[PDB]
Amino acid sequence: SPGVVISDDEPGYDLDLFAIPNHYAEDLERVFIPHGLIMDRTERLARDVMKEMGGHHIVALCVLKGGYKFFADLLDYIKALNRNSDRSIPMTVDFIRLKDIKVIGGDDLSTLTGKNVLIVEDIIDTGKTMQTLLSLVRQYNPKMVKVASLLVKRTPRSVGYKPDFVGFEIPDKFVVGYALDYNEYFRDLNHVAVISETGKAKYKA
Amino acid sequence: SPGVVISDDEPGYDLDLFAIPNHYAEDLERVFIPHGLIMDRTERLARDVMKEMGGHHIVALCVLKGGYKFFADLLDYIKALNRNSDRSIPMTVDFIRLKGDIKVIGGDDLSTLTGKNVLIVEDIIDTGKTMQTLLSLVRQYNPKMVKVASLLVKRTPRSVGYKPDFVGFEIPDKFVVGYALDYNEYFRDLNHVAVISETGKAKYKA
Amino acid sequence: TRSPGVVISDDEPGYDLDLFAIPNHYAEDLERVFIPHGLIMDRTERLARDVMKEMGGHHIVALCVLKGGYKFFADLLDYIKALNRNSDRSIPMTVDFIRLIKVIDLSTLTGKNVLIVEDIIDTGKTMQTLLSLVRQYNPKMVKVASLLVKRTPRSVGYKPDFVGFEIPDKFVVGYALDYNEYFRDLNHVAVISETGKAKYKA
Amino acid sequence: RSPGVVISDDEPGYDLDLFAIPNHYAEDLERVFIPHGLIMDRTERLARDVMKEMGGHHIVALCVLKGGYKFFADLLDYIKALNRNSDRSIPMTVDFIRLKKVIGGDDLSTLTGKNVLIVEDIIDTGKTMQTLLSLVRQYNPKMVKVASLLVKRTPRSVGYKPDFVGFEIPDKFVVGYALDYNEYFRDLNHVAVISETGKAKYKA
Ligand SMILES: Nc1nc2c(ncn2[C@@H]2CN(C(=O)CCP(=O)(O)O)C[C@H]2OC[C@@H](O)P(=O)(O)O)c(=O)[nH]1
Ligand SMILES: Nc1nc2c(ncn2[C@@H]2CN(C(=O)CCP(=O)(O)O)C[C@H]2OC[C@@H](O)P(=O)(O)O)c(=O)[nH]1
Ligand SMILES: Nc1nc2c(ncn2[C@@H]2CN(C(=O)CCP(=O)(O)O)C[C@H]2OC[C@@H](O)P(=O)(O)O)c(=O)[nH]1
Ligand SMILES: Nc1nc2c(ncn2[C@@H]2CN(C(=O)CCP(=O)(O)O)C[C@H]2OC[C@@H](O)P(=O)(O)O)c(=O)[nH]1
Ligand SMILES: [Mg+2]
Ligand SMILES: [Mg+2]
Ligand SMILES: [Mg+2]
Ligand SMILES: [Mg+2]
Numbered sequence: 001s002p003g004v005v006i007s008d009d010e011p012g013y014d015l016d017l018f019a020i021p022n023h024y025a026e027d028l029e030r031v032f033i034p035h036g037l038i039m040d041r042t043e044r045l046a047r048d049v050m051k052e053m054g055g056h057h058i059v060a061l062c063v064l065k066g067g068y069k070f071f072a073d074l075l076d077y078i079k080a081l082n083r084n085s086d087r088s089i090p091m092t093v094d095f096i097r098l099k100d101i102k103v104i105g106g107d108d109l110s111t112l113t114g115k116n117v118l119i120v121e122d123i124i125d126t127g128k129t130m131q132t133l134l135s136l137v138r139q140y141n142p143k144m145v146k147v148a149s150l151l152v153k154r155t156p157r158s159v160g161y162k163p164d165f166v167g168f169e170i171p172d173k174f175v176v177g178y179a180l181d182y183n184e185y186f187r188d189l190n191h192v193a194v195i196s197e198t199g200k201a202k203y204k205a
Numbered sequence: 206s207p208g209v210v211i212s213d214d215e216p217g218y219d220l221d222l223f224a225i226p227n228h229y230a231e232d233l234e235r236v237f238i239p240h241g242l243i244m245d246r247t248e249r250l251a252r253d254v255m256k257e258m259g260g261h262h263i264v265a266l267c268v269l270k271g272g273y274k275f276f277a278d279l280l281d282y283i284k285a286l287n288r289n290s291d292r293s294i295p296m297t298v299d300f301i302r303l304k305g306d307i308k309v310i311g312g313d314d315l316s317t318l319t320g321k322n323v324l325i326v327e328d329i330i331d332t333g334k335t336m337q338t339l340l341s342l343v344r345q346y347n348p349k350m351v352k353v354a355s356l357l358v359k360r361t362p363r364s365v366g367y368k369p370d371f372v373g374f375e376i377p378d379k380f381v382v383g384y385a386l387d388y389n390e391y392f393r394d395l396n397h398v399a400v401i402s403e404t405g406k407a408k409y410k411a
Numbered sequence: 412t413r414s415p416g417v418v419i420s421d422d423e424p425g426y427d428l429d430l431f432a433i434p435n436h437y438a439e440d441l442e443r444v445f446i447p448h449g450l451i452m453d454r455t456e457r458l459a460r461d462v463m464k465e466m467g468g469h470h471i472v473a474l475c476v477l478k479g480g481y482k483f484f485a486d487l488l489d490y491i492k493a494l495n496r497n498s499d500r501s502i503p504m505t506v507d508f509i510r511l512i513k514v515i516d517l518s519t520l521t522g523k524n525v526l527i528v529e530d531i532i533d534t535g536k537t538m539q540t541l542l543s544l545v546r547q548y549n550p551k552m553v554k555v556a557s558l559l560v561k562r563t564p565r566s567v568g569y570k571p572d573f574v575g576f577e578i579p580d581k582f583v584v585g586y587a588l589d590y591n592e593y594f595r596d597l598n599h600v601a602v603i604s605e606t607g608k609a610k611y612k613a
Numbered sequence: 614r615s616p617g618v619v620i621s622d623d624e625p626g627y628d629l630d631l632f633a634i635p636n637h638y639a640e641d642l643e644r645v646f647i648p649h650g651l652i653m654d655r656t657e658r659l660a661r662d663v664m665k666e667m668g669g670h671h672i673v674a675l676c677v678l679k680g681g682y683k684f685f686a687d688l689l690d691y692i693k694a695l696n697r698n699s700d701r702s703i704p705m706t707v708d709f710i711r712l713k714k715v716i717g718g719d720d721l722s723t724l725t726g727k728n729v730l731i732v733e734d735i736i737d738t739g740k741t742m743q744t745l746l747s748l749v750r751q752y753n754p755k756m757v758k759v760a761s762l763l764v765k766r767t768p769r770s771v772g773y774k775p776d777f778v779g780f781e782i783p784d785k786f787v788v789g790y791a792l793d794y795n796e797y798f799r800d801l802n803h804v805a806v807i808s809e810t811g812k813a814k815y816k817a
């Protein structure tokens with residue numbers, strides 16, 4: 001599936017209908033994807049992940065910083081599956097940051113050889129970052145490598161790359177929240193939201 | 206505040222995008238309000254309730270059976286507020302069924318409501334007749350205040366005009382199930398609010 | 412041959428209240444945290460699996476014994492629901508409520524797998540009375556889950572099928588267990604102090 | 614201040630059969646030592662403690678990978694919950710660092726003038742935290758505090774005590790809640806003690 005499709009003309013929600021941290025009160029335009037909805041969708045994705053990847057040792061690879069919340073929650077749902085089912089599989093974890101592009105941190109990638117590798121991202125936009133990471137990862141001969149991304153953006157700048165698991169397909173809009181940032185701000189927000197002009201100006205680099 | 210407005214044209218969500226119990230796989234047509242969204246809205250309502258009612262002992266009345274999930278979750282969010290704040294107020298609970306005065310079944314003596322901040326908690330307001338008549342009874346026990354929280358309010362021409370004090374979601378005139386709301390006692394064991402299909406309608410019919 | 416639950420010893424000190432988040436209106440009224448809320452959840456998660464193992468073969472009716480059972484009931488059912496939607500296999504579940512020995516329409520029990528959900532078993536006389544009434548409605552099976560079972564000489568020997576914790580002969584409150592209707596609005600199970608005992612005394 | 618929840622040397626832990634446990638670790642664990650839910654309850658109180666002390670100014674929360682990731686996520690979730698249900702709050706930014714040399718973080722100048730919260734899974738000798746602190750202090754934070762889920766009672770301690778502590782535990786090797794043995798047991802929600810067969814099976 002393309003995930004939960006959020007239409008171009010999605011109006012989102014009035015902030016007054018939700019609990020919002022006060023320090024971001026004027027910096028947000030609308031709530032775009034409620035935290036709870038992210039959780040419900042992530043619950044189903046964890047089941048899809050275990051269906052496809054639960055046959056062999058999984059290495060879950062978090063793409064920092066944006067990926068950290070989705071990663072923690074996805075893995076928590078996966079762990080819930082594994083302790084309430086008959087069949088389970090070991091899972092190990094690693095974290096990388098990407099800074100053209102080179103991998104920062106992480107274990108020696110020879111640890112990926114022969115494993116079912118799940119790369120976890122916050123968002124796919126152009127897809128160039130994932131294309132680059134995949135090309136690296138495949139050189140270490142994983143048993144399989146799959147990508148799960150909370151968000152996929154509809155954009156004419158797309159190179160054509162599509163991930164294996166998708167939370168939501170969104171319009172070409174700049175979103176923040178749930179660890180997605182604007183100049184490092186708004187990671188401390190449980191909902192995905194759209195940033196206001198006031199907010200854009202306030203936290204401008 | 207009419208709460209979160211779900212419009213008449215809202216298509217809801219395809220079932221294959223969520224985790225759905227297999228025994229209801231053919232009996233639902235769409236997810237209408239995802240459980241997580243109910244939780245986010247209920248978190249906000251809990252704050253609203255403490256703002257207005259947190260000044261004096263609250264008696265929270267759960268209207269069984271449909272109200273039980275909203276009740277449990279609303280009170281959980283209120284408790285979270287109360288153990289992470291500087292000022293706090295005791296809350297007691299009671300559970301009632303409803304069917305001259307409206308008949309209140311299974312609760313404490315209504316003298317328990319006297320001088321208290323009474324919060325009546327419902328799953329849904331439709332015609333509003335049930336809440337109007339319950340309020341006429343409860344006022345006679347002289348509460349310090351009485352307010353109603355309802356997860357759902359229907360837009361319907363059959364409404365007698367009653368509006369609750371706290372509302373989660375304002376929805377169309379369609380039959381919804383899940384989050385303890387039932388069709389012939391089924392679908393209470395579903396975490397999302399959903400619209401029932403025509404095939405599910407027949408299977409669980411009288 | 413069955414789990415006796417998490418056994419809490421007679422000498423269990425519990426936990427300093429200052430280590431946890433506690434509602435301020437109960438700060439002077441509680442002596443110790445006895446069973447942390449989160450531990451109740453962990454045990455309840457396991458109990459849900461045990462329930463589906465024994466009862467998941469046929470339509471389950473969960474019967475909540477009010478008022479004290481309401482929290483355990485809601486949480487236990489939420490864990491059962493999670494089990495039912497994250498697997499290809501599932502079974503319908505209906506719910507009912509009864510308050511108690513006098514009772515306050517149980518045709519919803521006939522031919523089904525009945526799970527009675529209780530907060531605590533002490534003497535056992537209440538459960539023996541409820542069971543004899545429930546069996547008159549000819550259910551397919553009846554089992555009882557109780558969050559707590561108390562070790563007491565006054566026990567008539569009733570043992571529930573599912574037990575969260577086996578506790579000493581101490582009066583506990585919280586997680587919907589009350590003292591004169593107070594302390595239901597508390598997430599942890601706790602022991603009541605001498606101050607609270609007298610403050611909310613009837 | 615407090616010493617945290619004190620777990621005694623003779624703490625028996627819990628029978629594994631009382632809890633939900635991943636089957637692939639069924640013979641690799643001896644006991645449940647700290648139930649996941651108890652960690653959450655303690656972490657909820659720690660979040661309130663942190664905000665009381667650090668909530669007056671922009672906080673930079675530093676996660677010490679890999680073991681700190683679960684405690685970090687949950688602590689910050691409870692802090693987020695406070696910030697959206699209170700009248701006033703403060704922004705928080707985050708960074709993740711691995712130690713071997715600080716790897717993968719932002720330039721340390723980003724800490725200058727900020728309230729810095731370092732978040733760790735466990736303090737044993739305390740040498741790591743003394744080292745990390747000495748580095749951070751070169752960049753003049755407004756304040757710097759350490760939160761550790763676990764602090765061991767050990768004569769190997771150099772004497773360093775963190776500002777926020779979840780649990781003070783015996784000198785035993787524990788796993789779970791992102792704490793590992795040769796990278797295993799991070800996918801376990803409880804904190805547990807490893808069995809002899811588990812140590813053998815996952816031996817490096
Ligand atoms: N907060 C937000 N961030 C976005 C948005 N669209 C893209 N991005 C990304 C900006 N971004 C980063 O800030 C990377 C560093 P970190 O924040 O530590 O994960 C990478 C962008 O994600 C997509 C690229 O990987 P791609 O074009 O190669 O597919 C957006 O609508 N909101
Ligand atoms: N599942 C569903 N139930 C609905 C719906 N609209 C109304 N109702 C209610 C049906 N109903 C009951 O079944 C009562 C018993 P319980 O199920 O144990 O709470 C009461 C109706 O709620 C509105 C009335 O109180 P009111 O018209 O006086 O305002 C609906 O769209 N779905
Ligand atoms: N808060 C607490 N309540 C307790 C305690 N021991 C017993 N009890 C029970 C007191 N109680 C009630 O108040 C019933 C009404 P409700 O509060 O609305 O569910 C029933 C007692 O539970 C056991 C009996 O059913 P049993 O002796 O027949 O097995 C205790 O240590 N704390
Ligand atoms: N799983 C476990 N790990 C432990 C335990 N005691 C110490 N440790 C630590 C082992 N360890 C690591 O493996 C670092 C890498 P990572 O696992 O990715 O965070 C660091 C040790 O923590 C304390 C040191 O910082 P310190 O002596 O300087 O205070 C333990 O009882 N169980
Ligand atoms: Mg990213
Ligand atoms: Mg970014
Ligand atoms: Mg109702
Ligand atoms: Mg109904």
Ligand SMILES: [Mg+2]
Nearest residue numbers: 479480530531
């Ligand atoms: Mg009882």
Ligand SMILES: [Mg+2]
Nearest residue numbers: 479588589590
């Ligand atoms: Mg009682």
Ligand SMILES: [Mg+2]
Nearest residue numbers: 680733734735
């Ligand atoms: Mg560490």
Ligand SMILES: [Mg+2]
Nearest residue numbers: 680792793794
């Ligand atoms: Mg380690």
